[PDB]
Amino acid sequence: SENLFNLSSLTHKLDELWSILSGFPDEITIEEQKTITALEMKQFMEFFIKCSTKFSFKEIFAITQEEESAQLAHFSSLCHEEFNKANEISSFLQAMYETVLDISKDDKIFTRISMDEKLYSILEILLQMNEFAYIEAIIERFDYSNNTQIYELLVKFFWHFFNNASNGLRKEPEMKKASQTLQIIQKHMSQRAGTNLTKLEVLLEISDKLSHYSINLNKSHNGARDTAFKPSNILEYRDCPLDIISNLLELNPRLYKDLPTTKSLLFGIYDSLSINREGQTGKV
């Protein structure tokens, strides 16, 4: 294989050898301990011709004979790279449905890992690819609505983008991503969000709202006042909410006339952080 790797018109030679292999029986006994059945070799050639030729056939046999985590390492690397250098990832995902990520049988290469791991991985990649349509295309190609791990990584990249937010504008790319992830939730994790999605979307709402005001809520006991307002601060201020609106009135001279809005703002910040309100709504 190493010798006939470095040839010309390689694709035609691969098609030729695969057409030869297609006539091969179910099993094949080969010379010694390193043993590859005809279905294993078939899946190998299929991944080569259709999915990728990055790893050598010996590398492929290694990955088959490697450790589960090592296999996931290799799969992650492979897809991560192929996504960067394929023209249209969709093609590659179909290829994954075709040779490696097919359910109609088990994968003889990544015998150490299940579909779910692979999907999880390419998902995280996709996220690092900021690719969204593919996310949900996938999730309902494989029906992971309200699935745990997908939901989790969603929340993960959610809080990630959230902790990446310097401001609160709708037009922000990061918040655009966050909005689209929340749309993912909305379309697919309805049974796996409770009210929380509500808290997230009112979070974005209040963020955009405050994004129309000036706030310097940053308790710097060395006196730093050169501070913009990051959303996650509210989490910090979880226990001192009205200090927020207080600085607002401190820094927005007319909002005092706007009881109902400010009121809804407190209410939304409360409800967002699951801030208990045991009839103390009157208090606040």
Binding site: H160, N163, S166, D226
Partner: protein
């Protein structure tokens, strides 16, 4: 490596200069860390970590040490760590709470081993004038741990945060308990409370705080 060293500082703080449990806090300004037990002085150590990671005392989530980071997961890992450093150390939140919900509560006593540099909290069942002396001694021990138990920046921050509450709560306590304290002309209670007042004044001074006087 970012995670590695920041976690390193993290466990240095939580296991070295500080150990904070739910009923005690020990500080040490000096630590022999690592298998080679290299020496570190809390003061300049957290000085430079603050300068590096907390310009203007606030979390710099747009800085290089965070903004340059690439891997999302690890990025928020180290983010949460620096946040926890800020809270527990750049802000000392747990101990601040511990103090407030401990100070001037009947049934809660606080010892201070200045030699061990440990403020220990405990449950008490003394009553009346005895628990008054007890809580005054405990608060005085808290102030002892302020003065002789904290670093300059530590004391400074912690004063900045609670000296208003210190002032008002100690004041109102003295007031409500004015009867038993002024019951006698010369009493270890009055001596001790004058100690606490002088000590709190020296706290305002050494801490050099203005937000509260």
């Amino acid at each position: 490596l970012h995670l590695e060293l920041v976690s390193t500082l993290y466990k240095i703080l939580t296991n070295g200069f500080w150990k904070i449990t739910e009923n005690s806090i020990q500080f040490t300004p000096t630590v022999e860390w690592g298998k080679d037990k290299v020496h570190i002085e809390y003061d300049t150590f957290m000085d430079f970590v603050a300068q590096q990671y907390f310009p203007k005392g606030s979390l710099d989530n747009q800085a290089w040490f965070i903004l340059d980071m690439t891997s999302a997961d690890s990025q928020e890992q180290v983010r949460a760590k620096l946040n926890t450093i800020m809270k527990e150390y750049m802000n000392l939140s747990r101990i601040v709470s511990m103090i407030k919900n401990s100070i001037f509560i009947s049934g809660k006593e606080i010892s201070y081993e200045n030699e061990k540099n440990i403020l220990v909290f405990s449950k008490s069942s003394s009553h009346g004038q005895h628990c008054v002396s007890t809580v005054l001694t405990s608060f005085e021990a808290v102030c002892d741990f302020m003065l002789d138990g904290l670093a300059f920046r530590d004391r400074k921050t912690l004063s900045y945060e609670l000296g208003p509450l210190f002032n008002t709560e100690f004041t109102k306590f003295v007031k409500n308990n004015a009867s038993i304290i002024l019951e006698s002309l010369d009493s270890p209670l009055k001596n001790l409370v004058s100690v606490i007042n002088n000590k709190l004044t020296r706290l305002v001074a050494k801490s050099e705080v203005t937000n509260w006087t």
